[PDB]
């Protein structure tokens, strides 16, 4: 996804 780390915070 989008945001932090491996892709956390959106969706």
Partner 1 sequence: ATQGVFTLPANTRFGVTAFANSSGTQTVNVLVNNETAATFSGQSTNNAVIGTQVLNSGSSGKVQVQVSVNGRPSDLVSAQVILTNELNFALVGSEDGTDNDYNDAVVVINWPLG
Ligand X SMILES: *C(=O)C[C@@H]1O[C@@H](C)[C@@H](O)[C@@H](O)[C@@H]1O
Q: Which residues bind partner 1 (CB under 8 A)?
A: 1-2, 5-11
In angstroms, give the least distance from the CB of 1 to partner 1.
3
**Residue 10 to residue 5: CA distance in whole angstroms:** 12
Residue 1 binds ligand *Cc1ccccc1C*, judged by CB under 6 A: yes
Beta strands (DSSP E) in the chain are 3-4, 8-9
In the chain, the largest separation of any two C-alpha atoms, in whole Å, equals: 15
Residue 4 binds ligand X, judged by CB under 6 A: no
Could you list the residues that contact ligand X (CB under 6 A)? 1, 6-9, 11
């Amino acid at each position: 996804x989008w945001x932090k780390x491996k892709x956390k915070x959106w969706x």
